Design a protein around this ligand. Sequence first.
Ligand SMILES: *[C@@H]1O[C@H](CO)[C@@H](O)[C@H](O)[C@H]1NC(C)=O
Lengths: 49, 44
Amino acid sequence: ESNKKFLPFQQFGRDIADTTDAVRDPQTLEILDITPCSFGGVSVITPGT
Amino acid sequence: QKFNGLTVLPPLLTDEMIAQYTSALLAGTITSGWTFGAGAALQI
Ligand SMILES: *[C@@H]1O[C@H](CO)[C@@H](O)[C@H](O)[C@H]1NC(C)=O
């Protein structure tokens, strides 16, 4: 649930690079946020074999 | 930009580590002249 509120004809939101980052539920007219699920790299520290 | 696989990695020296390096170069010049960059700091 977001602290954004927009005009009643708008359905979803976009940002500076045109990524969808907010959406309206078509039954309860609430504004949800969208964040990505967690990703990253895996790095292995070795002292040498 | 985190949506599409882009990340930013942090630097190895922080900003307080770089400020500690520049204040040690300043104190060596004000108290020793050019001697601390050639050996031991000799006050003058
Ligand atoms: C859709 O129906 C639900 C009933 O569970 C209601 O709460 C909601 O306000 C309705 N949305 C409309 C009419 O846009």
